[PDB]
Symmetry: D2
Subunit: 308 residues, 4 copies
Amino acid sequence: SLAPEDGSHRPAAEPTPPGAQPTAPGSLKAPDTRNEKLNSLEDVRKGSENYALTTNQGVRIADDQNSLRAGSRGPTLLEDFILREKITHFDHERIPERIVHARGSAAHGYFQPYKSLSDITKADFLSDPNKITPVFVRFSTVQGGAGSADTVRDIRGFATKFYTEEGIFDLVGNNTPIFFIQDAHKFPDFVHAVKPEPHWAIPQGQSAHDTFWDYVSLQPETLHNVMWAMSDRGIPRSYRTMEGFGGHTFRLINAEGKATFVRFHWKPLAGKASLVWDEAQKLTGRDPDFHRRELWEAIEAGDFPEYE
Amino acid sequence: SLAPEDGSHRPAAEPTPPGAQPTAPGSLKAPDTRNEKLNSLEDVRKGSENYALTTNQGVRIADDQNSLRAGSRGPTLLEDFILREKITHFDHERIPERIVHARGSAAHGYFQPYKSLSDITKADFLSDPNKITPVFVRFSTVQGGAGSADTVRDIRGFATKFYTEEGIFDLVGNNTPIFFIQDAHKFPDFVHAVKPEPHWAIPQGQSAHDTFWDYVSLQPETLHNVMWAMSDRGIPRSYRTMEGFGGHTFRLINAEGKATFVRFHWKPLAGKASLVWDEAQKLTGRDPDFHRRELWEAIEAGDFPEYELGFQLIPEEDEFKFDFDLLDPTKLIPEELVPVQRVGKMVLNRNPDNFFAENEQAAFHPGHIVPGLDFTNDPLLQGRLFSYTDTQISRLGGPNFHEIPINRPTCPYHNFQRDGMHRMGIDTNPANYEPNSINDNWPRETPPGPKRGGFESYQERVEGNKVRERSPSFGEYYSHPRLFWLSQTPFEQRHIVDGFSFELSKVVRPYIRERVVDQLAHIDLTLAQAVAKNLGIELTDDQLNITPPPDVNGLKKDPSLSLYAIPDGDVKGRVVAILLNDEVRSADLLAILKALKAKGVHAKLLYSRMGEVTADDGTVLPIAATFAGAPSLTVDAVIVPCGNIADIADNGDANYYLMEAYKHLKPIALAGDARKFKATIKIADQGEEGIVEADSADGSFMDELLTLMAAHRVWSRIPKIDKIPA
Amino acid sequence: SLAPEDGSHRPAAEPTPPGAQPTAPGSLKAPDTRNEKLNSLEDVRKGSENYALTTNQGVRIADDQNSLRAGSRGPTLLEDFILREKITHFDHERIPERIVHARGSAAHGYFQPYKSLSDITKADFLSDPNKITPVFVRFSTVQGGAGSADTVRDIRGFATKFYTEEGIFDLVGNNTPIFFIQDAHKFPDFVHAVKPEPHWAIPQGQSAHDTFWDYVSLQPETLHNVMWAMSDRGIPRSYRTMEGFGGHTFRLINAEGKATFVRFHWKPLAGKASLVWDEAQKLTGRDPDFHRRELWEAIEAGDFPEYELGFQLIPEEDEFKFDFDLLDPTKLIPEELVPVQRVGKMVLNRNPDNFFAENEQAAFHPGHIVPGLDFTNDPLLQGRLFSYTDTQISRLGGPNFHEIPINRPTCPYHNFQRDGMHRMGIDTNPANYEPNSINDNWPRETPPGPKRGGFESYQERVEGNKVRERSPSFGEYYSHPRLFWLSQTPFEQRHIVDGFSFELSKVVRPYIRERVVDQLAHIDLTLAQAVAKNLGIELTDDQLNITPPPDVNGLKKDPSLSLYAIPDGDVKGRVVAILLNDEVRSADLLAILKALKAKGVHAKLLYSRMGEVTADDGTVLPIAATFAGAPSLTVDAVIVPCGNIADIADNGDANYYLMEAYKHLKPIALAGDARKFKATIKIADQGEEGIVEADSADGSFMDELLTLMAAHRVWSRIPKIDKIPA
Amino acid sequence: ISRLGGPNFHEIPINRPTCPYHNFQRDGMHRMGIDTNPANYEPNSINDNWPRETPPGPKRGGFESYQERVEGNKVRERSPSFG
Ligand code: HDD
Ligand code: HDD
Ligand code: HDD
C-alpha cells in the first residue's frame, strides 16, 4: 500500500494548468508563497511524512486495521481505547454551518494601496503603498447549505479579512450594491422566506418557491435586489468575474477628525462575466463544485484572482 | 389581513395528486390520519391562526417591522430586547449535521405483523397481528451534506424507529445487503476516503474522485458494496422503489431462550426501479430535491410508501455451513440459499409538520433493541454500538436527546439518571440511586420472561485471546462481487461497466485507475476488459489469466440480486408528462387522463408558457409547468396528444423533451399528427418497441402505454441511443 | 422490598417543623399547594412508584448491578448499551454554572396586588387585587461558585420571575439598593477583582483579598455598596429577613402613556435580621448550606417567606430635583425623601421537586419586562439588557432556553422563530416569516393599548453626540456612603468598622490598605480613624482635615437604612436550642414548648449523644442532635431546663454551647439548677440583661425570653464579650 | 466532550503531548491543528501511506494489548470471588 515507483502520486510544487496535476494543500503546492499571516500559522501546521501513526495522546498504533476483541471472531472489548478515541473524534467532526452563506470557497492573498489615503482616513492599512496587508477571502452563495451547489441563482458573498497592524478589519460584502431589506429586524423574516420551506425543507439553493415570492410581493423594498438576482448577476461565471460591494455607507475618519461617507467596491481585474440560466442550472448537476474548483485551480495555475 | 379572499392560499385537507395544491405540514394536510406516536406529539405542536405575535417570553409585539432607534434615522438601541431575542434565535438556528447520511427525508407511518412470531422471538411488537406499532422512517444518502442533492450515485439509508410497548427499536439499514468494510475501526478511514477531499472540500455527493478509488484499490474487501453502488442500485427512481436491509446478522431470542440468527429485509411493494446515470446526474441539477419531493407528494396523494418486513433465518447449528462467514458484513446471504420469510407490513402515511424538529433532530441507533432481539459478534455492528450514542452528544447538544419529542418512547420510561443540558423531565423520586430504601427501591429491575420482562443478553460462549486480528474466515473478497455481477441482466451489466468507467475517468492519478481495473480482473474478466476498454487500458497476459473466484455454495447466479430480471413493476404513483398544444383534441385528452387515473398514474400538463390553453371543444386546460420547468427527467413517460401540432413542432424545448425522454429509455406515446415528432427521435415509419403510436389515443393506445410503464424502461432501446445527440 | 415495615422512610405530607421529618420534593410534601405555574408543570413531572427501571429508550433492565462481560471475571463488552447509556448520561450531567450568583436557593409561590394600579401602570399583573400571579424566586450570593457556602459576607441576589397573563416579568434585584459600579462596561473588571484571583483561584466566597480592595481603592464609585457589604447587611440571618431592591430607576407606563420613574422594593414581613461576623464565618464551616436549608425548612413548616412589593414613585418632571442623578445606580433614593408605597404581597409556599431541573436551569433577565413597564438610560441597566440573554446561549445550551419547563410562560407565545438546539415546539404554521399571505399573516402584531396590547417603548427624547463618557452628574462618591454610615446604630457602626478591619487585614500589600483608609477619610473621620487604628495606620494631617461630603438633600440620616434602628422583629419561624440532661424536669419542658408553640417558635432538643432520654415523670424525649452536631450558630436562642444538671455540668461541649451563644449576643435562659452555668459565661449573681433566669420555667420566664428574641440579639452585651474566650 | 467542548481537548495546551502525535483524525469543534497531509485515511498511496503503523517492539514500538485468555459466557454477573 504504497506510492507508485514513478512518483506520479505527488503534484509538482510549481504552477500548473487546470487538470495537469492532482490538486494539493496550498503549503505543499506553493511552499515559497508567503505572507505574514501564512507564516504565523506555522505553529499549528502538522506534516505527516516519516512520522508514526499515533493516538491523540502520542501513543504509537501497531494495528490500525482492527478492533480489540476476545478471539478473532469475538465481541469488541470496551478497553479498546484506540478504537474509541478514533471513533469519538469521527463522531464529533461536524460543527453548525453558518446560518446564511454556509456554502463558500476561500483563499489567502495580500493587499496594498496605490497611494497613502491619510487625507481621508487614518486607517493604517491604507496609509502606505508599500505596506502590504495579508488577507483571507471567502466567497459564498447565500441560501443553500454547505453541501449545496455553486452555480445556483443567488446573491454571492465576498468577505475579506484584512490582518492589519492595528487590528483585524473584515469587509463583509456581496456581489450586488444593495440588499433586499431595510431594517435588520426583518432579517429572519426575509431569510426564512428565501430558505427551504419549514414543513418539507425544499427547495435547496433556490428562490424559485412560494414563500420567497410571497415575501417579495408583500415587501416592495425587496424589488431592487430581486432585479439584480433575476439578472445574470445572479449566476456568475466565476468568483474572479463578479463585482463586490460593501452595500452600506460607512465612514472614513482622518487624523484631523473629518468624517467622509464611503461605500466600498471591488472591481474584478478579470472583467465581469456570468453564465446563462440553462447552463448554470444544468451545471449544478454536472459539477456542483464548479466555482470552488475553478477558484482553487486558477490559484494553482498562477491565474491569481485580482480585485481593485 | 393578506390571504386572497377566495381562500386559494390554503391547500385542501384531503388527498390530492402531485402539483394540484401547495404542499403543507402533515397535521394540516391530513388531520384525521393518526397513530399513537402522532397523538403523543400533540403536547408540543404549536398552532398560529388567531394568535398574537409575541416574544418567546409571551410579550405581544406591536411593530415587527423596525428596530428601536433614537430618531427614525438614528442608531439602533441596545435596550431593543425584541430585536435581540429575534436575531439571537436566528443566529443559533443550526445544529451540526449528521457525520454521515446528513441528507435525508422522513415520514410517519405504522407497522403490523402478519402473524405472531412468538415461536422465534419474544419481541412484543411481533407478538400479535392486531398490534399496531407506530414508526418514523428516514431515508437518506450517505456522503453529501444536508443541503446536497437527492439523485446522486450513493448508498441510501433506510432507518426505522419502531415505537414499541417494550421500548424503541431502531432498525438502521441501507439499500444494499452489505457494507464496504469489515471492522468498525476502519469506518473513519473509509468515510474520509469517500467524503470531499480535505484540502479543498470537493466533490460533494460523489465517490468519483481519487481518494475513494485509492482506498478501494488497497482494500479489496470494499469491492462487493462497490459493485452494488456502480450498478443502478446506486441511483434509485424513488425511496419507494428500492430494497432495504439491516446488513448484519442479529439474533432473535424466543421465550424458551433459543437464539436464531436473522438478517432483516424490506421489500418495496411498489417494486424495484432505478434511474439511468445521465438522467440521475442531470436531475441533481434540475431538481436536487427530487426524492424528498416525491416521497412527500406520494404521501399527500395517498400513494403511501409500503414495505414488507422479511427475515432470513438461520438456526444456530448452521453458523458454519456457508462458504462465507455469517458475521462478515461484506458478504450477503443469497435468497436461493436462505429465503426471506414475510413478517409484516409497514405503511408510511403522514408527513411531518416541521422538518427541523421531527426529521433533522430524530436520532436512530442500532443498539436501540428490545427484549426478543440481540446482537452478534459482527465486528462492524460491534463498533456501531459505540458510535450512535456518542455522536448525539454534540449533534443534539447532550445526553437528553431522548426527550426531544420525535425521539421519545411512547411506552413508560423511568430510571435514576438525572440532569444534563436541556433537562425536560422533572423527577419527583426522593431517590436518584438504587438500591434505595427511601422510595422502596422504585423504579425496580424486572426479571427476564416471556413478555414485559427485563433485557438479558443471550449467554453466547466467548473463547479466545484479547487480539486485534481479522478472522481468517473474512479473508475472501471476490466471490460475492462475482455472484452479484453474474446475477444482473445484460443491460444492468452494461450500466455497472459504465458506472466504473465514468467514476474512474474522474480519478486524476492514472495508476489508481489501473489498480482498480486489476481488482476487477480478479472478479470477472469480461467486466474488467469492458472497463479497461473505456479507460484506454490494455490488460496484461497475467491479468487475462487470473482464475475467477469460486461460486458461492454452488450458485452461479441468484436472480433476486437483480433490479429487473424478475418483473415486479407497479405503475401506481408514477407520472406522465403530457405535451400540450394551443388546440388539443379534447377526446384524446379525455381518454388519456381517464386511463391514467384508472391505474393511479399521475399527469402533468406541459406547455411553452404558464396560464391556460383552450381545447378544440372549448375546454380550458390549466398548465402545470413549462417544458423547461418540468423536464422529462421528472417523469416516467411522455404522451403527445393530437391537435395543432404545428404550434410546438418547431419548439426546441418540445423536441428536446422527447430526445431526453428517448435517450433515458422512457416510453413515449404519439397520437395522430404528434407522430411527426418521430423524425426528431429517428423512428422508422413502421415504428419501434417502446414508442406507442395510433391515429388517436383510443382503443389499445393507453393499454400499450401502461404496459410499457409497468416494465419501467425500454431496455431494448439501448443500442439505438448511442447515436442520438441529447 | 427495602423500606422499613413501619413506613418511617416517607415524610408526612403535611406541614411539620424543622427536623421533625426527612425533607422531600415539594409536590410530594405539599401535593395540594397549587398555582397555575405549578399545575402547568404537571406534563413533565415524572413519578417512580410501581414503575419498572428502564433505559431512556424504555427498555426494561433486568440487572442494574453488573456490566456485561465475557465470563464473570472477564472484560466488559462494548455491546453493553445499558451500561453505556447510564454512564453517558452521568458523564454529561453538569452544565456551566452562572457567571455570577452561581450559589442560590429557590422556591415557588404567588403574588397578589393590594389594589388596582391602573392609574400609574397598564401592567396586567397589577391591574386587580384578585389577580394572582405565580412566581418562582431564586435568592443567591454573588461571588462564590454553586458549591460555595451560604453565610459568606457578600451581596445577595433576590430574583423573581412573575408568570403574568401578558408575558414573563423578571424583577432581578439584590439585597442593597445600589450597585458597586456605574457603567456596565466595567462589570467584568469589578467581577474579576472580587472573584478568586486568576493565578491560583483563591479565595472562594470572599471579598477579603488584594484584587478586590485594589479595585475599590482606585474606583471610589464602589464605596457606597462596599459600605453596605461591610455592614451586617452582607450577612443576613435568612433570606426571609433581608430587604430586596431593583437597584435601578425603571418606568411605569399607564394607559394614557404617562411615564413615572419607579424604584422597586421588597419589604420582608419577617423583619430584617443578620448574623454577626464570627458566627457567620464559623457557620460557613459548620453548615455551608444553612440559608438553603433554612428556606426549604421554613416552607415545609408553613413559615412561608412573605414580602411586600414597594414602589418609590417619582414624577417625570422631578427627574432633576435631587442632588444625585436618578439614573446613577451607585445612589439610593432615601425613603425620607420618596416614601415606599406598598403595592402587593408575595408568599413563597412550595419548594421545587428537583433542584437541578427547576433552580439550576431557571433563567431570570431584567430585560424581561411587560407592557406597562419600561427602561431608563441608567448605564448599568442598559448594558445588563445585553448580558442576561447572551449568557444563556452557553449556560443553557442554546436559544430555546424558554422551552425549559421552569422558564416557559404560562400565557400564549407564538412567533416565527424556528429551530435551534433541543427545539421542543413543533410549529404547524405554513409560514415562518411575516408579512405572509399563506397563513393570513398569523400570528399577527397587536397595537399598544390599555390591556392585551403590543409592547411600545416610551418615546423618550434623545439628544447628544455618540460618546463614551460618564455623566458629570455621576461624579460624586462620598455623600451616600456617609448618609448610610450616619443612619446606622452605634453597634451597626462598630460592626462596619470590624468588617473593613478584618477584610483589610487580609490584603497582603499594605499600600492597598492605606489607600482604602484614605477613601474612608473622605466619608467620615470617625470611621476612617477606627479602621486605621485596627490596621496600625495613623491618619496624616491632610487626612484629618478632609471636609466631610454634603448631606443628601438636607438629610443627616435616614433610619430606614439601618437593620435595627426601628424594631420590626418577628419571632415566628425562629429556633431555640434546648440543652437536655438525663432527668429533665418535665414541668419546665412542658411550659417551655407550650409558650414557644404559641409564638410559632421551633425547638431542637440537644444532648451529648443521639437516641432518647427520659424525663423525671417518665416522658421519653427524642434527641434531635448532639451539642457538637447542631451548634449554637444554628439557633436564635438557648434554653437550659432544670433536672439532673450534674449530668451536663462538666461537659465541655455543653459549656461551649453557652459561651458561643453568649459571644454572638443570643438570648440565654437558665431555669433552676441550670443557673450554675452562669459561672461559664461570668454572669454576676444579680443577673444581666439578656440572661433570663428563674427558679423554674414559669410563664414570666418564657415572656422574658420571647421579648428578647423579638429584639433579635442582645446588643448591650457587646462590651462584655471581648473578655470571653470563645 | 461536554466538559471541554469537543473531541479536540488534547489540543488545549496543558493537555498536549510533548512527543510527536500524527494521525488521520480531522475537524471537530475548535480545531487547532491544520493538517497538510494530502490523505486523511489509510491505507493510502497518495501520501505513501504516512503517518505509518509501527510494529510492537522493545522500544519506540506500537501499542499491542497483552494476549490474555478470555473464556466464559456473555453475562451480567458479579464474580462469586468478589462476594
Ligand atoms: C442581522 C442579521 C444580518 C444581516 C441584516 C446581514 N447579515 Fe450577513 N450574516 C449574518 C447576519 C446578517 C450572520 C448570521 O451573522 C452570518 C452567518 C454566520 C456568520 O458567521 O455570519 C452572516 C454571513 C454573511 C457573509 C459570509 C461571511 C463568511 O464568508 O463566512 C457575508 C458575505 C454576508 N453575511 C454579507 C452580508 C451583506 C452584504 C449584508 C447587507 C448588505 C448582510 N450580510 C446582512
Ligand atoms: C462505527 C461507525 C459506523 C458504522 C461502522 C456504521 N455507521 Fe451508520 N452512522 C454512524 C456510524 C456508523 C453515525 C456517525 O453514528 C451516524 C451518523 C449520525 C447518526 O446519528 O449516526 C450514522 C448514521 C447512519 C444512518 C442514518 C440514520 C438517520 O436517518 O439519521 C443509517 C441509515 C446508517 N448509518 C446505516 C448504516 C449501515 C447499514 C451500516 C453497516 C451495515 C452502518 N451504518 C455502519
Ligand atoms: C452586564 C453585566 C451585568 C450587570 C452590570 C449586572 N448583572 Fe446581574 N447577572 C449578569 C450580568 C450582569 C449575568 C451574567 O447575565 C447573570 C449571571 C448568569 C445569568 O443567568 O445572569 C447575572 C445574574 C444575576 C442574578 C441571579 C439571577 C438568578 O438567580 O439566576 C441577580 C439577582 C442579579 N444578576 C442582579 C443584578 C443586580 C441587582 C445588578 C445591578 C443593579 C446586576 N445584576 C448587574
